[PDB]
Design a binder for this molecule. Structure first.
Ligand code: YTO
Ligand code: ZN
Ligand code: ZN
Length: 231
């Protein structure tokens, strides 16, 4: 019943967590540079189909994700959106594509994934190239807040449930630094978070790219930890 953590997640297994009616997060763990991390994605019911947001960080994790969705939900995943180009978002796209899932990302994400040697979603999401842009995609809205954790990071809102999935632009309340900042814009990140706060003031649940969901406080906390990292 509590939100899953690594201590409950061996690398290779996947857990789902009900967030709201027709909204789950998925949680998996992965090793990277000799340390183990959790990471989140999202599942949104789309009538009798499912929309997936982000892979489960790796090929075997993503296969395990699909099997867990079949066990717990039993509806087919038909589309997936990756919210930036790092392996915790696109690693497993090849598994999805071989399982019949149509994979999508912004052109920016596709270019960055290709340049870095990461797996590449098939379809380009236009209409997201300027900060503040939003488009509909099934039961969600996709929003480009500006550069933050990465230049291409997207945010996802589920209007039926007022669920804000921040992806890696948003950190959990317990965080003590801004995570993996290799590709970040620390100077722009607070402005991008401010755009998220102005756009989605009625968000009830906020989900970070890694760690525990909470409320709107995650947004201000993220700005605070990023500013202190920069300083
Ligand atoms: C898949 C990959 O993405 C980075 C990358 C760079 N180049 N290519 N891939 C990745 C690999 C390994 C670790 C991470 C983390 C991370 C998240 C939170 C904390 C705890 S905290 C907020 O208090 O600091 C952290 F310590 C690290 C992130 C992210 O922050 O989103 N992305 C990671
Ligand atoms: Zn990332
Ligand atoms: Zn991340």
């Amino acid at each position: 019943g509590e939100y899953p953590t690594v201590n409950e997640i061996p690398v290779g297994e996947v857990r789902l967590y009900q967030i709201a009616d027709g909204v789950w997060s998925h949680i998996a763990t992965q090793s990277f540079d000799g340390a183990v991390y959790p990471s989140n994605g999202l599942i949104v019911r789309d009538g009798d189909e499912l929309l997936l947001i982000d892979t489960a960080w790796g090929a075997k994790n993503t296969a395990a994700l699909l099997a867990e969705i079949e066990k717990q939900i039993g509806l087919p995943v038909t589309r997936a959106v990756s919210t930036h180009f790092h392996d915790d978002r696109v690693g497993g796209v090849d598994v999805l594509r071989a399982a019949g899932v149509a994979t999508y990302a912004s052109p920016s994400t596709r270019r960055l994934a290709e340049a870095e040697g990461n797996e590449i979603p098939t379809h380009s999401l236009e209409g997201l190239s300027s900060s503040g842009d939003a488009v509909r995609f099934g039961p969600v809205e996709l929003f480009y807040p500006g550069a933050a954790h990465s230049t291409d990071n997207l945010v996802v809102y589920v209007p039926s449930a007022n669920v804000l999935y921040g992806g890696c632009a948003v950190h959990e309340l317990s965080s003590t630094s801004a995570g993996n900042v290799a590709d970040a814009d620390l100077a722009e990140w607070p402005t991008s978070v401010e755009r998220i706060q102005k756009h989605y003031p009625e968000a009830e649940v906020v989900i970070p790219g890694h760690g525990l969901p909470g409320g709107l406080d995650l947004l201000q906390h993220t700005a605070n930890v990023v500013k202190a990292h920069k300083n």
